């Protein structure tokens, strides 16, 4: 187990068939979780579970370019529960990131940042106890 915030290096960036697995437990009374796939200061893919946005649970995804957030993609399907162990899997495909939680498909996010081989860091932050962060090629 690791203390958040945690930075997982992605040397030479990401590539199709790369499967990133994040294991942990959501804290009790969690407010937020964030995964940030970064290309330098740009955030290619921000994955942001919010547990109380106007008393609703929502997944927010976005990209940050030149320090500016773009158009949010939102999902009401919310597989996380406070206090419970989770597995987030991000599968890199040619045209999108595919996300599954606890072995159930959640969403896809089309690549806005095109240079996959420069997306060289994954930041993990928010209201979790982080057990592990690793990747493999499927």
Ligand X SMILES: CO[C@@H]1[C@@H](n2cc(-c3ccc(Cl)c(F)c3F)nn2)[C@@H](O)[C@@H](CO)O[C@@H]1Cc1cn(C2(C(F)F)COC2)nn1
Region binding Cl ion by CB under 5 A among candidate stretches 3-11, 26-34, 85-93, 97-105: 3-11
Residue 127's beta-bridge partner residues?
Answer: none
| 70 labeled part of a ligand binding site | yes
**What's the closest the beta carbon of residue 49 comes to ligand X, in angstroms?**
8
The string of DSSP letters for 84-111 reads: -EEEEEEEE-SSEEEEEETTEEEEEEE-
> Assign residue 113 a region: left if phi > 0, alpha if psi is -120 to 50, beta otherwise?
beta
**Which of 102, 108, 120, 125 lies at the binding interface for Cl ion (CB under 5 A)?**
125
Cα(51)–Cα(78) distance, integer angstroms:
9
Choice from 18, 19, 23, 60 touching ligand X (CB under 6 A)? 60
Count the site residues for Cl ion by CB under 5 A.
Answer: 3
Q: With CB cut-offs between 5 and 8 Å by kind, which of ligand X, Cl ion, none does residue 32 bind?
A: ligand X
Q: For residue 132, report the phi and psi dihedrals to the nearest 5 degrees.
A: -160, 155
Side-chain-side CA neighbours of residue 86 (13 Å): 23
Which option in Cl ion, ligand X, none does residue 119 bind, with CB closer than 5 to 8 A by kind? none
- 6 versus 135: smaller Cβ distance to ligand X: 6
Identified binder of ligand X from the candidate list 46, 89, 109, 128, rule CB under 6 A: 46
Cα radius of gyration (the chain): 14
What residues are designated binding site for a beta-D-galactoside?
A: 69-75
Given the rule CB under 6 A, which residues bind ligand X? 32-34, 46, 48, 60, 62, 69, 72, 125-126
């Amino acid at each position: 187990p690791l203390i958040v915030p945690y930075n997982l290096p992605l040397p030479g960036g990401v590539v199709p068939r790369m499967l990133i697995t994040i294991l942990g437990t959501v804290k009790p009374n969690a407010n937020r979780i964030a995964l940030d796939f970064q290309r330098g200061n740009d955030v290619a893919f921000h994955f942001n579970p919010r547990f109380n946005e106007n008393n609703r649970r929502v997944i927010v995804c976005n990209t940050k370019l030149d320090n500016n957030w773009g158009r949010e993609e939102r999902q009401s399907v919310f597989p996380f529960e406070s206090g419970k162990p989770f597995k987030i899997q991000v599968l890199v495909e040619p045209d999108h990131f595919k996300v599954a939680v606890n072995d159930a498909h959640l969403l896809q996010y089309n690549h806005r940042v095109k240079k996959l081989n420069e997306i060289s860091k994954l930041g993990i932050s928010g209201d979790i106890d982080l057990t592990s962060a690793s990747y493999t090629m499927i």
